[PDB]
Amino acid sequence: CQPIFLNVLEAIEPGVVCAGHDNNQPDSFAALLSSLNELGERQLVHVVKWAKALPGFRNLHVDDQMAVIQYSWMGLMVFAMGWRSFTNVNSRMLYFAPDLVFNEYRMHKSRMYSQCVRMRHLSQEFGWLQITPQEFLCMKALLLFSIIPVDGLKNQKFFDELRMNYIKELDRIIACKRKNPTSCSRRFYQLTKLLDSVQPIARELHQFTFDLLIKSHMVSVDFPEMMAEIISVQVPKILSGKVKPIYFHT
Amino acid sequence: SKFAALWD
Ligand SMILES: C[C@]12CCC(=O)C[C@@H]1CC[C@@H]1[C@@H]2CC[C@]2(C)[C@@H](O)CC[C@@H]12
C-alpha cells in the first residue's frame, strides 16, 4: 500500500530559497529587515505554488485559495523556518535562509528579539517532541487551513471538508507504528499543542511587520510589492479581529 | 495585483 497523500506532500515540498542578503556588510536593522522582506516576497511565490499543488486545494473557490494563503503565510513560513533551524543547525540559530542565519546578536539587532526567541523555542520543540519529517509535512499543510474570516469564506463548507481531511491524514500518520490508542491520543495532543503555539508567534510578527510598514520610510526598510499589499490589506483584518486562527485547545 | 497574477 503506497502512501499517496504523503507521497504528494514530499514531492511538492519547496526547495531552498535564498534571501539575497549581503553578509559582507556589518549588520544593520534596515538591511536585515529589508532582506527578511525580500525573503518573504520570494517565499510567497513558492508557498503559492506549493499550496496550489496540495491535494484538494483547487476545489476551494479561487478567492478563498488566495485568502487562506494571504492569512496563513506567516505561520506557514515561521513553521518551516523552525524546522530548517532544527534540521540544519540543531536550533542553535534561526535559519531563515542559507544566506540569512540569525545568531542572538542579529535577533537583537532586528528589534524583534522576543519573537526570535519564541521561534527558537519552536525550533527546539521539533527536537524535544521528536517530530518526524512526515509529521512536519502534514502539520505544515494543516497550518494553511488554520485561520479564517469571521464572516466566512465564499465556500466555507468546502474549506471545512478539506481541513477535516488533513486532520484525518495526520491521524493516520500518528497511527503508523502506534498500536496503542492512548499513545495516538497523547501524540495528537502534543502535535495540536505545537500547532497552536505557532499562532501567538505569527500574531506578534503580524503586529511587528504592520508597524514597520507604516514607518518603513522613516527607518529605511524596503517592502516588496506583494508583501506591502498583503500587510496593508489582509494583515490588518487579522489584527483587527476580523480574521482569526482556529485553535485546537483553550 | 502581482499576487493575484499567480492564478492567471
Ligand atoms: C516570514 C519571514 C521570511 C520567511 C521565513 O523564513 C520566516 C520569517 C519570519 C519573520 C518575517 C519574515 C518576512 C518579513 C517580515 C514579515 C518582517 O517584515 C518582520 C517579520 C518578518
Q: Which three cell numbers stand for residue A99?
A: 544566506
B5 close contact with A: CB closer than 8 A = no
Q: Which three cell numbers stand for residue A158?
A: 468546502
Number of domains in chain A: 1
Deposited experimental method: X-ray
AA identity, residue A129: L
What are the C-alpha distances in Å from A116 to residues A28, A113, A169, A202?
16, 5, 31, 11
Nearest CA owner, ligand 1 atom 19: A209
List ligand 1's pocket residues with C-beta within 6 A.
A 33, 36-37, 39-40, 43, 74, 77-78, 81, 96, 205, 208-209, 212
A8 in Cβ contact with A55 (< 8 Å):
yes
Within 8 A of A233 by CB-CB distance, chain B residues are none
Select from A240, A232, A43, A201 the least CA-distant residue to A120: A201
B7 close contact with A: CB closer than 8 A = yes
Asked if B4's CB is within 8 angstroms of A226's CB, the reply is no
Asked if B2's CB is within 8 angstroms of A229's CB, the reply is yes
Q: Which residue from A47, A73, A96 has its CB within 8 A of the most atoms of ligand 1, so it is best to mutate? A: A96
CB neighbour class for B1 (10 Å; exposed up to 12, middle 13-18, buried from 19): exposed
Q: Which three cell numbers stand for residue A33?
A: 529587515
A230 in Cβ contact with A209 (< 8 Å):
no
Domain range for A174 is 1-250
SS3 of chain B = CCCHHHHC
Resolution at which this structure was determined, Å: 1.8
Domain CATH for A136? 1.10.565.10
